[PDB]
């Protein structure tokens, strides 16, 4: 028979892995649904091909050493990697993970939810953004793409791609395009909240000037203490030229949203970063009263750190790292 292809791209995965189907896709790779013929359930395969970037080879080998250390219900993990048996010969890496049902992308493209549905699945998100925070890790991209959701409405937080040690524009904290921290992720879970009262991305930026403009355009114009920070010229000398912008409440752009609901919205939708609210502080907010457990909501035993300075690495000692990381999962 041979390997098999999707839309172009080799999938050589077999003979564990048959029956692919296209699910998804990305910067560097693509994602597909594929038959696990040893535990007889469907998997996802995420293929990527990151040895042409040296930036890429850095987020492969990030990604794959953070999902292997991590060990949460709200965090995908990694089942299994394949690769080539020589390194010469690997081109690309295989990440198996466990299948979800959809994403919340998907689910508001298509359906309204209950404040209870909507207090669930911030609460799943923060519980594991708790985990991530603890072991003193950035997810840089939190989207509702990058949130997976299963048939009875468990979620799971994927694409540890962009992560770091302590992005979409549209979920994008104010302080990368003004000038990173734990509190750009506090910023991204405010946006999806957001979006989950109403469908729709609150602020809709085409690029970076017209991002800064939506955000302006709710919170209203920044204060002096909002500026006062390490802030870039050109984008101060912008905000400072444009006129003044009033601040529209949170209850006259969400008018049925839960009162709780948009207190919440309005601490972690904050400008300054470092007057934002915090994950945990975030769990204990009355909104989230009849799930907050913190019994129940495990933290890493001790912070992360890489043993070596990846960003000084070139792309052929990435991909022998890459390589001795991946060996583990190999036959023998
Ligand atoms: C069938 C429904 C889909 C989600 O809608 N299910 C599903 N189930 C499990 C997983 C692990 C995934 C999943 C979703 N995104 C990704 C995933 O890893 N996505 C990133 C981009 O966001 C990516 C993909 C390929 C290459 C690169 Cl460089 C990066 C995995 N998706």
Redesign the pocket.
């Known amino acids: 028979a041979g390997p098999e292809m999707v839309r172009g791209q080799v999938f050589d995965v077999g003979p564990r892995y048959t029956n692919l189907s296209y699910?998804?896709?990305?910067?560097?790779?693509?994602?597909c649904?594929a038959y696990d013929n040893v535990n007889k359930v469907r998997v996802?395969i995420?293929?990527?091909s990151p040895f042409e970037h040296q930036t890429y080879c850095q987020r492969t080998l990030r990604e794959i050493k953070i999902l292997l250390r991590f060990r949460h219900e709200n965090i995908?993990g990694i089942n299994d990697i394949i690769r080539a048996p020589t390194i010469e010969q690997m081109k690309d890496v295989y990440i198996v993970?466990?299948?979800?049902?959809?994403?919340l992308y998907?689910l508001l493209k298509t359906q309204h939810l209950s404040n209870d549905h909507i207090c669930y699945f911030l609460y799943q998100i923060l519980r594991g953004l708790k985990y991530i925070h603890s072991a003193n890790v950035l997810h840089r991209d939190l989207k509702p793409?990058?949130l997976?959701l299963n048939t009875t409405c468990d979620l799971k937080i994927?694409?540890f791609?962009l992560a770091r040690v302590a992005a979409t524009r549209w979920y994008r904290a104010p302080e990368i395009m003004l000038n990173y921290t734990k509190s750009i992720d506090i910023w991204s879970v405010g946006c999806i909240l957001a979006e989950m009262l109403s469908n729709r991305p609150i602020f809709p930026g085409k690029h970076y000037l017209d991002q800064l403009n939506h955000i302006l355009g709710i919170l209203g114009s920044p204060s002096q203490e909002d500026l006062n920070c390490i802030i870039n010229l050109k984008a101060r000398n912008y905000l400072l030229s444009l006129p003044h912008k009033n601040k529209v409440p949170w209850n006259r752009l969400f008018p049925n949203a839960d009162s709780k609901a948009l207190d919440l919205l309005d601490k972690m939708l904050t400008f300054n970063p470092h007057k934002r609210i915090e994950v945990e502080q975030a769990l204990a907010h009355p909104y989230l009263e009849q799930y907050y457990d913190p019994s129940d909501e495990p933290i890493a035993e001790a912070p992360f750190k890489f043993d070596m300075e990846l960003d000084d690495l070139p792309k052929e000692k990435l991909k022998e790292l890459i390589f001795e990381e991946t060996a583990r999962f190999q036959p023998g």
Not at 97 to 103: A, S
């Open positions: 699910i998804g896709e990305g910067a560097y790779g693509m994602v649904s996802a995420k293929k990527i995908i993970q466990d299948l979800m049902e959809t994403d998907k793409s990058n997976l994927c694409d791609g």
